[PDB]
Amino acid sequence: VTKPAEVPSRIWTYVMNADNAYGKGGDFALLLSAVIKKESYFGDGLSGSPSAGDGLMQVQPNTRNAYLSQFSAKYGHAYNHSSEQDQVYMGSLILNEKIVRFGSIYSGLLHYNGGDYWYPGATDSYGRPILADQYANTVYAQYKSYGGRY
Numbered sequence: 156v157t158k159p160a161e162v163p164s165r166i167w168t169y170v171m172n173a174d175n176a177y178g179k180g181g182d183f184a185l186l187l188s189a190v191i192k193k194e195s196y197f198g199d200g201l202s203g204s205p206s207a208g209d210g211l212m213q214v215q216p217n218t219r220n221a222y223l224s225q226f227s228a229k230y231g232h233a234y235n236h237s238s239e240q241d242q243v244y245m246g247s248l249i250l251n252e253k254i255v256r257f258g259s260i261y262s263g264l265l266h267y268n269g270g271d272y273w274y275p276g277a278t279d280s281y282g283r284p285i286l287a288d289q290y291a292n293t294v295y296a297q298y299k300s301y302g303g304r305y
């Protein structure tokens with residue numbers, strides 16, 4: 156498992172630390188890279204969007220709020236939204252939780268993006284349509300393009 160050429164150095168460190176926290180041997184870091192690419196384009200695709208303030212993994216305010224105590228338990232410090240490493244840790248925690256609970260990567264991605272109760276036509280906290288199925292397909296492909304085994 157090596158860094159994909161297109162993934163910026165700073166991002167790779169973030170996702171690799173997150174991977175170490177879950178004991179995933181570099182593979183989760185590949186999945187998180189794909190997630191971050193889609194969500195924020197490594198931080199270059201944030202401006203212009205109403206969800207810009209939501210950071211690298213685009214975790215929505217009410218979702219961040221829901222997982223605050225769990226984040227602190229997992230990582231030993233309070234979630235700091237100004238920290239990019241924390242943004243990645245928070246996104247990783249939520250994504251891991253969906254994958255473990257729903258039983259697969261594809262489904263974890265789908266429900267990461269749409270919530271547990273996503274249906275076609277459902278909108279986000281900004282009123283934008285959530286295309287959770289398409290999100291999952293393209294992010295799963297990218298994870299595989301990066302060399303993801305599972």
Ligand SMILES: CC(=O)N[C@@H]1[C@@H](O)[C@H](O[C@@H]2O[C@H](CO)[C@@H](O)[C@H](O)[C@H]2NC(C)=O)[C@@H](CO)O[C@H]1O
Binds near residue numbers: 268
């Ligand atoms: C066609 C395509 O891949 N377009 C990308 C946009 O989807 C993308 O926006 C992000 O999309 C996610 C759903 O796929 C949203 O959860 C997320 O909020 C949204 N990010 C922002 C900042 O609005 C943009 C930005 O990364 O990149 C396009 O390539």
Ligand SMILES: CC(=O)N[C@@H]1[C@@H](O)[C@H](O[C@@H]2O[C@H](CO)[C@@H](O)[C@H](O)[C@H]2NC(C)=O)[C@@H](CO)O[C@H]1O
Binds near residue numbers: 268269273
């Ligand atoms: C990564 C991210 O932030 N995804 C968002 C989903 O969490 C989110 O779903 C809603 O999350 C709330 C807090 O966890 C829940 O109270 C609520 O049940 C849940 N809604 C559904 C339909 O599952 C969605 C929609 O708000 O936005 C995503 O971007």
